């Protein structure tokens, strides 16, 4: 599958300038739509491993450097050091060619003074003549065919300066420790890696005109002192009154891009709490509640980069007010001093000012606004990059062979501003061949002491040993993207012989049956395609596929059913791991007969450490056409996209009124602008008819109105100032308008996707699109747009000038413009599946990074840092080969538009004089002048429209998602009366459920009657719908059958209102960033009293309260502070706050010791004993007391009857599974359940 080589490396210098290696490529692309494996590889100096690590080596150089001086490091050193070598050299080539562009004016303005003294006799002027126009070519070629290959080159450095960037900062993330997990989020770095990057490329491109800019004015202004006296002198005067203001502008430049970027990081910071809990999200009705806060800080950005395109439009407009301004200047001291023009003194400064302004006025504020946020980019990433590191594992002791694990007086804190430690007292050994228990209540310190042995908790006092390798086992399964043997190998070979003895000692054989593809089936990220118990397992298979030394497995059995528990912990751990070293934690109290260490952990205090025998002898307890890979690539069909797009984003900005004064004050603007140069040269034509009739006898003497010239030629001025100050403001307040209207509608739009959606599209596909897509519309779209909009004014202008000559000149404008309209379309055709391909191959590496920030746990306990680099290069350089295609490509269209516009010059030079022989200046002079400033605009036109075609074929990813197809709306026109439900009996009839069109049945035939005010309970083996039948219910995808609640179809009510009325406890646990009180309530309603009563009631306050700001407490990613069972109570006092009608709960005492499971169970039983309610668990000790109880076997209802008519039917499913787990719990089950039984149906006699 190797990538042909690409051509450029195998090219000639002929064919590298003008880009011939391109015509195969086109000729591909105006047929067929370009694929995949038709981008070229990158050459194998640009790739990013051999950037990014040679980029490292001067980091920790710099750094190394600054620690021997002590003091503070800086990355813009290192970066100098690393690029000021493969750059120094491109700066002799801008400082010929600013120098060049002076010296074309020169003999620009010497050609036509032959022209003004036409003789027929000396052939001295023609030869001169002749060595003029020579000159003007090779300084002309010099000029239009180098640069684009310098620009190409200046872009390539910047492409792998942001590539060593990106993987310099994915290499500082994969090594943060759990204190600088605290500090940064998700959001950053996708911000990082995302926008603080894309300005790197750029940044490096102007920097030569930056620092060119005073050395060509003060050149133009010594050359300009020649001809003109000390009147010049005001120019130079302007010119260093208006630098200095630019210079200040990067103060408040750089200030508003830091509000942007600590503005923009919490704006990034809200995608995982929407995006990965969007089941938790419509489960509970919080939509309104994110937008009520998302929107908000979208509002507060755009406020923010108000001021920021204000400037921006500032400097654009006095980009082409300086202009005029320096023309108005020294001219207003040369009219006045005496002393007039006719042609020369004009004809010159303004064929200088020509050429001096397009880089004086145009580099030099946007080079000040580059470095201005590239100053902040790079500090950003040098505060992102000295965050506090992992601590690294030591060099471990010569050992004598034998692998194991010691601990001795071990003392550590989470949180160093804490006053109470995680562990207290630890002393204990494990040796192969033993089988360690880890015992406690919730929040004692059990996955601490699993996560000392790895190495994320840095050891305070003590000391730690570990010899050999560790297969850790999280107690949150994770599950990346891929197909389930690519999960279980992770890196390993494929083994069948081992393969199978895995699947079948984790009972994954049915599971693997019961799948319409066994293990080749693709799996979403985060694992939201498999269940719970699913995943559990598969994490257990993949650790043992390992065939490491050390599982420390962090409570892989409360997840799964009890029938299997029993099996797996059987062929598992007592008879596959029973040679290696292990550490099992759980809460049964059944699995510890099998176990010959148990350390029963108390607040991280070693009460008691010894066997089970010892804890029954002194009398202590402690009870007390294969599914294709997530759906690839499917944006195609970019075949010239018309109007329909432009109309949506001119309409989302403001209203007609304002759309069309707009254009009115465009062409004012425009207008303005060519009446000021229409008067200075009737001005000057007035003027030199004045000298000529008072020098030829000039008997009267009538002075022109001094004053009223001077008044009407500022007052022009100062109206077209103004007026282009005005549009420019103008249109940059409709683009951020427009912009900030798409981005709230895509906002709205996607919250309202169906739940399919976020299963089957990778969360890199849709992130990407909300942070650079949607990020580029307030950094490249209105300079984008705006720069062009003014370019076609001025060449509207130029041509409205040029059509009052003699049409002989405008003639051939038809073939050249036919010509230029069929290249860009032969060039976009091409250049928008380029970029559709360049974002396509960029998505991939948000989506791989999104998988490897939340799963970098796991990955640092397997060691496979070396195959996560190896990934995260291959997916940059899929995306770096397609930059890098673009930019060629756009190079190749820049410089076959400037072979053709100098083709034209020199036709246009050549053929004139066969009939311009006899006729002389002024109507054939200055036309070589006429035609270049013609061809400039035209070349600059060109590029302008490419670009903003480019930009509006990227917006067109943001505009596709407008429409985003839906489920049934939110309310219907029938809403169900205030006291719905007042009763909520729930009544099935043949339902079914499918998550997808198509695919393979859940639910088949499930029929079941559920009684108001009756606790029905559910169980059965993993996977078999107990979820599904939960989805069916609140109607996460359209089922079949009829569910009737209360006399009322769930199929004839709005969605919002059926799930408001229905509380659920969700399976798995998941916070919300930022405040306590915002994550028990947003909306900001519950009291504090009832706030604390529900605390008092799941207790949680008697640790809440240990915390200074027990409702302040800002809380990490995903609650990274809080454990599982902090977060399961939490959602448990949630449940409660919400007090509804309807209750079920769906996974509650998953990870929960059994007294503070009996103590919030028998407070839901007394509090919720009016109400209906659906729970669900895997232990019956807390639903052996319920009315009925359901049995659902792979999705169909096999029997539901009461619990004691279940118990007396040894063939009953719900009978087999309970004669496991010991006798002595099963014998005390049978008899609460019977003494339930009997004291329901004869309480005469009971
Ligand atoms: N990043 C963190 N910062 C500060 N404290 C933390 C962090 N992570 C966990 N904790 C603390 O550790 C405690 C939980 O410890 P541990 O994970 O070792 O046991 P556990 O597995 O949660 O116990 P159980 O399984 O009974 O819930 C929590 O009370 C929490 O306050
Ligand atoms: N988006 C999806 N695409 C394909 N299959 C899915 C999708 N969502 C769920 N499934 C399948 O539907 C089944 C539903 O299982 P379910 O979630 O009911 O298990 P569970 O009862 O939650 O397990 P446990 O009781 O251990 O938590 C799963 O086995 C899964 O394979
Ligand atoms: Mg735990
Ligand atoms: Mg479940």
Redesign the pocket.
Known sequence: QEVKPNPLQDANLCSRVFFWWLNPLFKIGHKRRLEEDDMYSVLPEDRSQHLGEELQGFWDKEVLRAENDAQKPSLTRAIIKCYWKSYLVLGIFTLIEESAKVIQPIFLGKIINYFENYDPMDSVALNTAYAYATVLTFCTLILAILHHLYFYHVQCAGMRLRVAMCHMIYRKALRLSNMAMGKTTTGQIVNLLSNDVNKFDQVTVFLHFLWAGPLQAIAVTALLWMEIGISCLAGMAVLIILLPLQSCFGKLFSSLRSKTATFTDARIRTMNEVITGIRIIKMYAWEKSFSNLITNLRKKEISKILRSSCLRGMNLASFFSASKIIVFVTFTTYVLLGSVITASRVFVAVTLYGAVRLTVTLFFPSAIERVSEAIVSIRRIQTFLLLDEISQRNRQLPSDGKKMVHVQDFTAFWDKASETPTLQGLSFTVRPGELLAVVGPVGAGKSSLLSAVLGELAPSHGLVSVHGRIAYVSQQPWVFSGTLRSNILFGKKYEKERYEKVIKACALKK?LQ??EDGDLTVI?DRG???????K?RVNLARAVYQDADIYLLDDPLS???ACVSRHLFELCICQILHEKITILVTHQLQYLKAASQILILKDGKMVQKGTYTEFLKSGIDFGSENVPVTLSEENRSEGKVGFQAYKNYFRAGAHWIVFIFLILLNTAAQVAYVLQDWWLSYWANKQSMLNVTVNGGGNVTEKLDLNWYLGIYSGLTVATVLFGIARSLLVFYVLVNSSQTLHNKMFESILKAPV?FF??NPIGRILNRFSKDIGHLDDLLPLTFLDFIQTLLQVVGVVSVAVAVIPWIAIPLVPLGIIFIFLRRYFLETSRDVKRLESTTRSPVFSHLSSSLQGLWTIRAYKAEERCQELFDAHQDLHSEAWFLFLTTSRWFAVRLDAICAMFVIIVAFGSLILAKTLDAGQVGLALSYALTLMGMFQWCVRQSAEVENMMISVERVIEYTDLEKEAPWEYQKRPPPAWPHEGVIIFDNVNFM??PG??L?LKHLTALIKSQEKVGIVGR????????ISALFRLSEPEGKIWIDKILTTEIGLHDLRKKMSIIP?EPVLFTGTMRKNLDPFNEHTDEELWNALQEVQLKETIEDLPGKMDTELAESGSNFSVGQRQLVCLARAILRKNQILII??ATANVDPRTDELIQKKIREKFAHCTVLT?A?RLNTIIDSDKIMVLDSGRLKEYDEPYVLLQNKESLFYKMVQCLGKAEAAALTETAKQVYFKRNYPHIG
């Open positions: 599971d019961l799948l979403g939201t395609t498999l269940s719970g118990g699913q559990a997840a799964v059913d399919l299963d089957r998550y997808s695919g393979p859940v993993t996977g078999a719908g107990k979820s599904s039948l399976q769906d996974q669900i895997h």
